[PDB]
Design an enzyme around this catalytic site. Structure first.
Site, short mmCIF file in Angstrom:
data_model
loop_
_atom_site.label_atom_id
_atom_site.label_comp_id
_atom_site.label_asym_id
_atom_site.label_seq_id
_atom_site.Cartn_x
_atom_site.Cartn_y
_atom_site.Cartn_z
N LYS A 132 -4.88 -16.16 22.67
CA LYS A 132 -5.75 -17.00 23.43
C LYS A 132 -4.89 -18.42 24.06
O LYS A 132 -5.02 -18.94 24.74
CB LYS A 132 -7.15 -17.47 22.83
CG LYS A 132 -7.92 -16.28 22.97
CD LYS A 132 -9.00 -16.28 24.17
CE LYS A 132 -10.22 -15.08 23.72
NZ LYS A 132 -9.43 -14.15 22.72
N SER A 146 -3.58 -7.82 19.43
CA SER A 146 -4.30 -9.12 20.13
C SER A 146 -4.61 -10.21 19.01
O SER A 146 -4.44 -11.32 19.38
CB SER A 146 -5.53 -8.69 20.79
OG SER A 146 -6.31 -7.45 20.09
C1 LIG Z 1 -9.85 -12.81 22.73
C2 LIG Z 1 -9.39 -11.53 22.67
C3 LIG Z 1 -9.47 -10.24 23.26
C4 LIG Z 1 -9.55 -9.95 24.65
O1 LIG Z 1 -9.73 -11.18 25.62
P1 LIG Z 1 -9.78 -11.24 27.11
O2 LIG Z 1 -8.76 -12.02 27.82
O3 LIG Z 1 -11.30 -11.69 27.48
O4 LIG Z 1 -9.91 -9.55 27.55
C5 LIG Z 1 -9.03 -9.23 22.57
N1 LIG Z 1 -8.56 -9.05 21.56
C6 LIG Z 1 -8.60 -10.34 20.48
C7 LIG Z 1 -8.08 -10.39 19.09
C8 LIG Z 1 -9.30 -11.60 21.17
O5 LIG Z 1 -9.15 -12.78 20.64
#
Ligand SMILES: *Cc1c(COP(=O)(O)O)cnc(C)c1O
Ligand SMILES: *Cc1c(COP(=O)(O)O)cnc(C)c1O
Lengths: 494, 494
Positions: free
Chosen positions: B58, B311
């Site tokens: 993020k 992610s």
């Molecule tokens: C926020 C997030 C996502 C996906 O976010 P998008 O940009 O909306 O697709 C996926 N995995 C993790 C750990 C996240 O924090």
């Protein structure tokens, strides 16, 4: 080679400085614990040793020892050990130096551990039953094939290579007050003390050992490497019976104190690491924090800069479970209730309706005939004791509950896995399984929707964070008829 | 600012290249999974995004968007969002740019999540009940105080900042075949596709979404951001109802395919990460692997170089439990047995004696009168089915057992937490608790030592990796008299 005696302070220094560790190992971050440090009142820092490629520190010493052997073409000759977490270090090392290594392990070790080693490099030979048995072989083969025994700890070289860390430490934060060191055989503490002690004397160096693996404390007390009758096996890598030796007992003349601790503590220490640094320890890797935590309070050490070592990180995913489970016990997380609700023909609903918002962890019941069928209830709390205090009183408006959760070791550890059984006399019930997206009060809904006109004889529910099959219920949102279910028969039915 | 329209391919590129991400974020390692890759037959690589200082990705986008706002002295003005994992990104960013941020969250969020944010920097205002409710405020305050709304995803800038990763990826391994991307709101997939698609077209880009949060697949199918009725809540960070928007639906014109998957899979994917890289995912952080795993087989993709994104990593230590618990189910780890043993006056011993070496996970029994009191036994296996096959037959030399472990969803998920209950008629028993170092056959010893002259009415035992209180037994190595124990009464006694 150059150490197999009684190295003198400095000689160690030299060995430390001269040791080729970085060809295989890496300087490891030394980060500060923000939550904890702020909690307790000192600066707490962790020595991220789990970041080596073999996830622990062992790599240092095996590398040092092994890499300074070859000055003797006795690699040509060879090397051998016997293990699980250090067999890894050697493996990794053997490969890098292109020196053939052989790892002896018990006969029924564990695919997982056998493949890691095989992985890293190294050839294993599974021969044993007992460990000592695996090592009798290793040692045999030495003598016969001429492999070079590589100590997990008893060794000046091996020791010098571990000091390496100290060397880093001091260069990473020289304003350190105390340092906490885990104690298995004593390699690491041994190499850490000498160094610091040479370089910066004012640094305190506390060993920290397993209540159950207190090799050192014990030898200390006799002033004699002493065999331990029994050795715990949580903190695997710290499970040593008779401390190091000379090198170890010898070297522990630079140690400032010592401290033991229990599996339960370690389990917290693990929680801690995870929660602040998002690091994943392995019992011994958390062992040293736990100690700290202990020392902190003991001596009411406030205001210092202290650091410990995240020794290693080799743990089974599933091992994680146990841990949690243990910390939970030590925590004050949930409410465990023996709430007797009067009905049989009517419902649990009313009872529920006043916990509709609150989070349900368990809600287990079995027909029993006593005008009031009792209910094992569990409720996830926030405000700890205070919030429970509520639930309680609140619930004081109707049925009478009992607070079996406080110190009820019995409930908390056994009975909350025992509520059920059999009824009394045969029963004309039907079994069904239901599943439903968990939320804060999904149950209710389930219950509400389930209706109130049921002669429900059985209920079972464990929840957010432990099971996805939601409910099992017996009468007289997704459904499955599970009636004459084998398990049920044999144990619930009756 | 410079994007609030319909950026064109290149414009994104530019925005990508021009975005100041590294002032706050870091290039993340891209390591290969040795176990898995070798398992399946491709090179599998993970994008270690959990290594940012806010443990997820993020940070990129909030930083990009926020840092290129200030070209307008509207930081002087301010910024605000509403969240849990992205509120973190903004926090971290606000502080670095010295731009005041305000984070709105529901009213009963969770100390933990509230402090992280507070931690990073940022001021929170807990106002809500529902989330939408928290956001109505945020949005309010905007309008009134003039704070600048900072999207978790719907935003060209935010999107451009995520592409950043792609940018890294391609520079980290240009011999990539396919890339798997998690899909929450769509920021990340959106920014990843455009890039790659511009730079290296031949790269396949598969979104991977929650069976239960399939925002995208759904909008895709209508060709219309569509509100979802319900949204799972495992994969928190992926719990979006109506995909992004324009930017997202728009941008998903660079997407090569899409794929969903279930919580159960995610739970494995988590096991995987951990076991090979020793990385700790968070459902959505594992979500994308799981997909892969899925795609791999679907298409029988053998031989490729594929990578996915780790992610994020924000997960509760205790959340870990659930996971394990779920994978265990999917695994073939233990034996679950309804073994009926004839005795009452004699013992369980004989029965045990032939599992003396084998590892006991559970051994729970309650007096019942049927000439043959039945026993819920659990045995930790290695050889899976094959080894069980043994136990079984082996046990065929005496009492008759039933193999309730295979597909017995009922046992495996409910009953193995239900065996007990009450007897039949009142009982003149006494309760005791025993604890003993766990080993491979400690029980036996316990049993042996316990003797054979006991009218044991109750037994309870769960073991290595889940509980340290060892045994609870009821008659007619450490001991504690736990007789008139409250829990017991209310639920076992009877
Ligand atoms: C926020 C997030 C996502 C996906 O976010 P998008 O940009 O909306 O697709 C996926 N995995 C993790 C750990 C996240 O924090
Ligand atoms: C090997 C090891 C130890 C302690 O080793 P010694 O040098 O014998 O004291 C401690 N923690 C971990 C993770 C270990 O692997």
């Amino acid at each position: 080679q150059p150490l197999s005696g009684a190295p003198e302070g400095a000689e160690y220094l030299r060995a430390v400085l001269r040791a080729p560790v970085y060809e295989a190992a890496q300087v490891t971050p030394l980060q500060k614990m923000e939550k904890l440090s702020s909690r307790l009142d000192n600066v707490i820092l962790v020595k991220r040793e789990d970041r080596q490629p073999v996830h622990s520190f062992k790599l240092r010493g095996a590398y040092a020892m092994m890499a300074g052997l070859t000055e003797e073409q006795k690699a040509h000759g060879v090397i051998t050990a016997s293990a699980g977490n250090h067999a890894q270090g050697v493996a990794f090392s053997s490969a890098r130096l292109g020196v053939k290594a052989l790892i002896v392990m018990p006969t029924a070790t564990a695919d997982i551990k056998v493949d890691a080693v095989r992985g890293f490099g190294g050839e294993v030979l599974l021969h044993g039953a007992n460990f000592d048995e695996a090592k009798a072989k290793a040692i045999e083969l030495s003598q016969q094939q001429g492999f070079t025994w590589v100590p997990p700890f008893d060794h000046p070289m091996v020791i010098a290579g571990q000091g390496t860390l100290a060397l880093e430490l001091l260069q990473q934060d020289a304003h350190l007050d105390r340092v906490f060191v885990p104690v298995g055989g004593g390699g690491l503490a041994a190499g850490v003390a000498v160094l610091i002690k040479q370089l910066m004397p004012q640094i305190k160096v506390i060993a920290v050992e397993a209540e159950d693996s207190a090799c050192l404390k014990a030898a200390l007390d006799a002033g004699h490497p002493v065999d331990l009758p029994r050795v715990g096996l949580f903190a695997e890598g710290v499970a040593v019976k008779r401390i190091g030796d000379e090198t170890f007992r010898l070297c522990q003349e630079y140690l400032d104190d010592i401290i033991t601790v229990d599996s339960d503590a370690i389990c917290a220490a693990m929680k801690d690491l995870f929660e602040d640094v998002r690091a994943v320890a392995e019992p011994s890797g958390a062992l040293a924090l736990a100690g700290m935590k202990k020392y902190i309070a003991l001596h009411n050490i406030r205001g210092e800069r202290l650091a410990h070592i995240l020794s290693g990180a080799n743990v089974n995913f599933h091992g994680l479970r146990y841990v949690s489970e243990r910390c939970e016990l030590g925590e004050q997380r949930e409410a465990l209730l023996a709430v007797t609700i009067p009905e049989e023909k009517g419902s649990f609903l009313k009872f529920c309706q006043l916990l509709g918002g609150r989070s349900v962890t368990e809600f287990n019941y079995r027909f029993a005939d006593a005008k009031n069928a009792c209910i094992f209830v569990g409720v996830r709390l926030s405000r700890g004791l205070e919030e429970r205090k509520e639930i309680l009183q609140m619930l004081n408006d109707g049925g009478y509950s009992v607070v079996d959760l406080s110190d009820d070791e019995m409930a908390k550890l056994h009975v909350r896995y025992m509520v059920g059984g059999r009824p009394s006399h045969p029963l004309q019930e039907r079994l069904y399984s239901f599943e439903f997206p968990e939320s804060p009060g999904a149950l209710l809904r389930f219950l509400n929707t389930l209706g109130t006109y049921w002669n429900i004889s059985l209920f079972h529910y464990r929840s957010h964070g432990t099971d996805y099959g939601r409910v099992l219920a017996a009468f007289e949102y997704d459904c499955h008829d599970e009636t004459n279910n084998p398990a049920f028969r044999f144990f619930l039915a009756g």
